[PDB]
Design a protein around this ligand. Sequence first.
Ligand SMILES: Nc1ncnc2c1ncn2[C@@H]1O[C@H](COP(=O)(O)OP(=O)(O)OP(=O)(O)O)[C@@H](O)[C@H]1O
Ligand SMILES: Nc1ncnc2c1ncn2[C@@H]1O[C@H](COP(=O)(O)OP(=O)(O)OP(=O)(O)O)[C@@H](O)[C@H]1O
Ligand SMILES: Nc1ncnc2c1ncn2[C@@H]1O[C@H](COP(=O)(O)OP(=O)(O)O)[C@@H](O)[C@H]1O
Ligand SMILES: [Mg+2]
Ligand SMILES: [Mg+2]
Ligand SMILES: [Mg+2]
Lengths: 187, 180, 479, 40, 51, 12, 487, 512
Amino acid sequence: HRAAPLFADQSTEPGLLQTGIKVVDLLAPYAKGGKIGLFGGAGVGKTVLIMELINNVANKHGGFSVFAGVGERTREGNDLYHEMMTTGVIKRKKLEDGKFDFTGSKAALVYGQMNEPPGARARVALTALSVAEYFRDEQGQDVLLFIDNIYRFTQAGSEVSALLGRIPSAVGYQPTLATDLGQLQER
Amino acid sequence: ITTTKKGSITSVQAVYVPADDLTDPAPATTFAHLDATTVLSRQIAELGIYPAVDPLDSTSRMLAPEIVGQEHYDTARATQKLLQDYKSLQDIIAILGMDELSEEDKLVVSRARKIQRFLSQPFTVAEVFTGKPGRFVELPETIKSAQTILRGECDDLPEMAFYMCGGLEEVRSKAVKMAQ
Amino acid sequence: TNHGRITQVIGAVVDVHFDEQLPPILNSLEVQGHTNRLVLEVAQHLGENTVRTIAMDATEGLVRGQKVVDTGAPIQVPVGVETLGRIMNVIGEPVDECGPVPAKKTYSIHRAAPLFADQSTEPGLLQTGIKVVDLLAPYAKGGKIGLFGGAGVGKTVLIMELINNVANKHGGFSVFAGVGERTREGNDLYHEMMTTGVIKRKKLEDGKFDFTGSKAALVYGQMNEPPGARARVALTALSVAEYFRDEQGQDVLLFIDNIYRFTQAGSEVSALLGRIPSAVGYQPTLATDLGQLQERITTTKKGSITSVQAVYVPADDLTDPAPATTFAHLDATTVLSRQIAELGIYPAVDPLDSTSRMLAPEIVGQEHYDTARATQKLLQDYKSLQDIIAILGMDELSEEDKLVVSRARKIQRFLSQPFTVAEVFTGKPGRFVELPETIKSAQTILRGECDDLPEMAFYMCGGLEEVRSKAVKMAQEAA
Amino acid sequence: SVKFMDQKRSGEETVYFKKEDEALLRNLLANHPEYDPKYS
Amino acid sequence: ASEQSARMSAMDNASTNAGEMISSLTLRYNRARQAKITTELVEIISGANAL
Amino acid sequence: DLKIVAARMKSV
Amino acid sequence: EVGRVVSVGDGIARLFGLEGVQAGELVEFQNGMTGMALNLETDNVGVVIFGDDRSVLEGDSVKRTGRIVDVPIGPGLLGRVVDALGNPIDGKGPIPAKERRRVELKAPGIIPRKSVHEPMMTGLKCVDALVPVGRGQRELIIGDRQTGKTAVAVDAIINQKEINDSTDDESKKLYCIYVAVGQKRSTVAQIVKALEQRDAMKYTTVVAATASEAAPLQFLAPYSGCAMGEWFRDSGRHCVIIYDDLSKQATAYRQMSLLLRRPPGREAYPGDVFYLHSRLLERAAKMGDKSGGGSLTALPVIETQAGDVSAYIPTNVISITDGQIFLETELFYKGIRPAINVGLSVSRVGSAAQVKAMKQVAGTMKLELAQYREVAAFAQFGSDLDASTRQLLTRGTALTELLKQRQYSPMKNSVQVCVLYCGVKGYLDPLDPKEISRFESLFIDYINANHQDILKTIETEKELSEKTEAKLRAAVDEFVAMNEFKK
Amino acid sequence: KISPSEMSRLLEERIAGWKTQTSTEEVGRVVSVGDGIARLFGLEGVQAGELVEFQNGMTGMALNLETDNVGVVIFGDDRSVLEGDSVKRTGRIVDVPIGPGLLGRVVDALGNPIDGKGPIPAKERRRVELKAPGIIPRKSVHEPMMTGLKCVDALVPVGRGQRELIIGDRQTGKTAVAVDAIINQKEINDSTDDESKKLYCIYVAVGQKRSTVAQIVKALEQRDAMKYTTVVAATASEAAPLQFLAPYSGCAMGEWFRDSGRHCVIIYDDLSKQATAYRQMSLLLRRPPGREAYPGDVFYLHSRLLERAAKMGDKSGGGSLTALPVIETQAGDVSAYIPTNVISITDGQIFLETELFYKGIRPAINVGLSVSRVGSAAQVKAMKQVAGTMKLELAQYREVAAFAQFGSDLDASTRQLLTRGTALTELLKQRQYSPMKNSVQVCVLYCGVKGYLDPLDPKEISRFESLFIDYINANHQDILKTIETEKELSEKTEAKLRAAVDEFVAMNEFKK
Ligand SMILES: Nc1ncnc2c1ncn2[C@@H]1O[C@H](COP(=O)(O)OP(=O)(O)OP(=O)(O)O)[C@@H](O)[C@H]1O
Ligand SMILES: Nc1ncnc2c1ncn2[C@@H]1O[C@H](COP(=O)(O)OP(=O)(O)OP(=O)(O)O)[C@@H](O)[C@H]1O
Ligand SMILES: Nc1ncnc2c1ncn2[C@@H]1O[C@H](COP(=O)(O)OP(=O)(O)O)[C@@H](O)[C@H]1O
Ligand SMILES: [Mg+2]
Ligand SMILES: [Mg+2]
Ligand SMILES: [Mg+2]
């Protein structure tokens, strides 16, 4: 739980993000400090797009990346971990004593499992967001944050508000919806 | 608010309807206390018709032939029948088109659009944002015009000649000027 | 007997204070000093030797501090052959104006269901004399049956026809429970039962009565009664039937009109008992309160209870929680429709929503199973062609589709039949169609033998031969 | 649209099959004389 | 031939108009769905807080 | 209501 | 005993004391105002006030009378307008009645009843023919706003003056009760004026619980009317009671229950609304020959919103009534007045509440109207049709134009029989539809001028023998000969 | 508003200086009872989820610990319990036995049998609410389950470690799909001595009535299926806590097979019933509700339940626990609360429809909405080779379906799609309690996709398949053994298959 950047410590000059993908950089150009919706499930090649974004932003922009799993399926997390270890995004090399040596990688992971209660699934995106704010502030390099799924974060907030006895809003959602989404997205 | 043996209060109340929902408790309760009703509509205002009165949801208790004459009552009921018959064809006109309709239905649609546009009056207070002068209209002129439009003595005229004209002499003059 | 004092009164909910020896839940309490008899059923324990109870009759005239007496047992209803030919209330009191019930025994309406070890019997087939029922939704002899429908579709008429066609021929006994129906219907049913020998009242010179024979028992909790009565009258009738099942061992027939009222009664008091409402106003204890009832209705190794429940479906919405929960408790289902009754097709059974566990090739042979499934396939095909007919017209349909439409219309008109009790609506006489005739006729219509016959002929005809006779008459009247 | 289509369908089917029933009633007794009471 | 050409054109226009009506009805359906959820939930809550 | 709009959507 | 007021607000009081109060009894304050005790809580008592709460002052003394809330009954009410509690508001004299009756009572059981066999002449044609009503029945009049419900009920009231004037046997007369809940006094005065203008008040009474009147009076007025009608029911005299609108009563009950801090349910109503209307409508009944043979017919009225009968109150009152008379605005503006939809409208009693002379015609009429409704949509589009189909359309249009009626212009049963005979046997097919509105009127005058004997015979024998059949046919032939129309 | 300590029997003790608080943390006094809930004063020391025992032998679960009282749900009726009774801790959290002693036995939600055959041996008693496995111990799904249905095994495959929801409307054939999945394992389990190639089965029932659980047991005993499965029955007469706990008891019983390395499949009937019971327990404890009165702990509930279904790695044993939860949708709207919560949790969807159940399409699987996020990875290559074609063919049929009523006016290249789609749809039909093996499925689908059924009348296909099966089962058992052993359809076996098909067609004669 960290306060967002102030009005003074904020850049007024917007700028694109050189990914290295043609359709993206042509018809849907991204931006620094932006928030990009990704409407697509499985059977479309989303995970490979994710790994490519990570690798290309690490090579060119020199910036690391973060992945947050907000109430994701556990087997999907295992699959993603193995795909990352395969594609070279993660470098898990065994050591002599029996430890591991995570050498130069390109992404941290923060998994909030579906089996976790509400309160954990609601406070996972903030964890990865702080992990990324570390690289932003002291390291001073651009970073990519992936959240899968934003709606699940909203569901966790609604549940947590229902447990504490707060009267729900229009469609059952909590009355602190836009405020919490802003506390997240303004960072 | 009620007329008594001492005096009388006529009342004209404007009743808001939130979210265009007439099933709201407030207007629903208020309907029971009224002697006359005038339900304005947004669908009719989007067509540029003003006053945007829905003549089917509007009603009154002083329409019976024991108060107004039988010519007034009959004209009003014929107009209501015509507009309901036009409303009943809105779906099939929107999906398929006017070509599917028969000739009786096409005549009905013509007269219904004409009488809709004819029930549109430019007021005096609207001159500030409309420009056209006001038109006071007596009752017998309205009844004669409705009778003529229903009989079929005005099918030759266009449809946009009834828009904001008051009586029929204005409609015929506007049709003349529009012939050019 | 203990003694208590009424503490407060809120509608049909009464709090009572005892100085000692609180009564268990479901126990019955009698108010002392009232005009008529007033029984209360314990529902909750609140604290401080206080309980919360539900009144069977109106609380008008009750006073705080008024005295209450515990009976040491729940509402005990009389049972035996003495209840036969006789009407009874929720508390066992008679309302037939013929004398008191001289029963030598009483059973508590609250009992525990038979366990899993007490298995059912074979799925015995039940012949009602109705065509669509015997064909597409065969009723089991030992299982629950449901009649789902809104208002004005023919539930009460169908139950009355089933009574005429089953209860009279039944060698065992029978029970009826009126749970929040109209009282006029009860009077009509009682008179019809006295007429057709199902009840045999014989007055005596000494002012008494004699209900010898009279293989039927009636229980009534009608709309005029408050909640607490409408809820428990079903348990009353079910205990009356459980007596004949367990001890006597005779097969029993139970008819319930409507079960939904029983669920509604609970909602009427739940918020007064301090419960939070459920989805659409119903109580939380809906599924459990209904299952505790339904599980008591089941065949065992001592007897069998064949039940027939009419389930009101408000606004023709089958997604409502009450019928939605009741669907899972039934062996056979029969859903009545308004769209069909508009066509004058009575009984207005929808053969695409009616189902039955019995319709399997091992229970009913393949001649029955394949016939039923072919009928259903034909009707679904006719239903899929409705939009093409409505937009384009019959001109666009091929001859195969026209044959399909003709056969489907003939089947629809053929499943109709006139009942004996509907004479006072149609004037036509009643029919009793056995099942082999139905199967023969359906096979004949589906095979294409009767394509020549006109569609109008298949109306209110018991058998195909009658259809031929009607077609002959219509052709002769044509010239 | 709903009641419109439903009633249109019902009327069209009713008319079509009324015509067909009129023809079948005309041509019945010839092709099925065993039912014809004239021969009974 | 002219009849068949006009038939194809009419079917095109009818399908387009049907798509438009479907869009409008979808909006109305979602609005009514949200309203139903809110109404039922407010009923439950008001019955829960009046205890 | 809902049933009305759903029925209309299905028909269309 | 006595008590003192502890809290006051919104026409409701919370008392401390009166430990010997009966739930539902009358209570008197020290300023003349009355109340009704409903919530007998432990510490306090919840009273609903019959008037304004400006009089009560949080400390006022309060006393119990011991009487359960009751109302007067008798023939002293006939011709009078009274409030929910029997207090008159006509402004002319008190109520001369000695015997009282409790408001909330137990309905009669299953044994002291019998089937419905006598009809209740409504005066209309579509009702008396296609949706018949009996004596002992409970038939709902459900519709939208401004569709002709109160008009139906008032025509039912007006049609009885001829039947009552031409007899002195109370067993055949039909008395009437009009309960006005939620209405404004102008409307009730208009109804009273319409009835007095036609001498239709010497056999009616009115129970006005208007909008300014507090919620408890609107909640109690229908039960007061049922109590006034139970006198006729148990004395062997038939009566018909009309409730306008019942939904207003439900709203008043919701208000009272919510201000007594009772928890709500669906649409903020309680769960006891079904019990409320069942309590009220099950008191209508047809008693046996041992209990006098009386009756109390009921004709409740309900206003739906947007024709939604899937709502909570309409669904209940539909499920606890013996019929329905639906009324639609589309039919009201198309020209059909009364706007009765004969498809949805039904009557479970049916022909048993119908005369044989009306059965003979109404069966054929119902069949023909079903066929016409079935092919009406197809006919509008315009396609070639067979002569039989065209004939069906012509007869259906004729009958639809026959069942129209003016307001406050009811008719006798024999005249309905004659008119529907003219309509069914084909004396209107070639005639122009728009002309029928005078074919009716003239024909009526003709058969009231020269053929009174046919009407007397139908009124007495209540059937159509072949002689009356032939006489009526000859009369119709003479009428068509003497007159000329557009076809 | 008064506290249990503030009642006027204890304050007479406190005011009198009585300090008889030696009443231990084990014993408490009932304070309130109603609707299957009890509220106690005492037991300061009881754990959440702990069992407690009353005077009259009944037992309950403590859920809502509070500062002044304790909320208990009862495993029975409230007529036994009354205010003033005593309650004592058992000390043990709710648990259930596990082992081979449950195979062929029907039990309630606490292991207590209801078959009437005898007690249950149990060397191991496992908790009911446990932590699910993590991420490292798990493994990717690479093995099928073989329901026995053609449509599922081909187009909506189910792997070992998967969670394939069976969602549908009332009376569509969900329980039938489950029971077919149970029955198809007979030939595979009886044809093996090792307990690692087998597949055990568990059938949890919730909200059902006994008169159909008994029918299920009867059907499985007819076919000798109960020897390798067990039933958990929490019926409608049984109280809400038991309906709520039965699925967790089943998962506990299956965790033994998972950890041991044995493969088991668990079926839940219906989960929605469980949600309803939980709602009934939360609204009576006066917990705060949500939409449709469901609490916020419903997603957590189904998630805790289903995330135990897993495929463990070779270091844990290689076991698995497949799941086939069943859900009833009331109008096909899968936008409701519980369906939307469950489809988000699951790795697939089997959507059964009612319009197809009456068109003869039984099982009524709508392959358009039915998916499997695992996919061909849960298929042998012999099935991939035909399924990759049939899926495309049925999609093409789905694009030209409305033209079936106008195909007389169209041309070729669009009637062929309709014909092939119709033939395949008539092929995928199946009979109740008559599943097939994967080899026979491959053979039949090879006959189908390769055009050997286009020129036939559709109504005769149901004959064709049957005869063909007997034909191959009479003549070319070697082909079936090869397909079952090698799990591949090579060109030589494909040529053998075409030869057998040609011989079969030559022997028999069909309509069109
Ligand atoms: N048979 C009829 N013929 C012509 N007009 C009629 C007829 N019946 C009723 N009306 C007219 O309908 C209008 C409404 O009258 P009515 O008093 O019956 O309203 P309502 O249906 O009771 O609804 P509400 O009282 O809530 O306004 C009146 O103008 C009346 O003249
Ligand atoms: N392949 C099939 N072939 C023929 N009939 C089938 C088939 N599958 C299911 N059925 C039949 O469909 C009906 C429903 O059976 P089933 O109980 O399995 O469905 P369900 O969805 O579980 O019903 P419920 O809602 O009561 O749980 C039964 O009559 C069954 O025999
Ligand atoms: N077999 C039938 N034949 C003719 N009319 C019927 C038939 N069944 C019902 N009806 C009509 O519908 C009405 C329904 O009344 P009822 O039998 O009590 O059904 P429900 O209780 O479901 O409303 C009947 O009064 C009758 O007018
Ligand atoms: Mg009924
Ligand atoms: Mg009115
Ligand atoms: Mg099932």
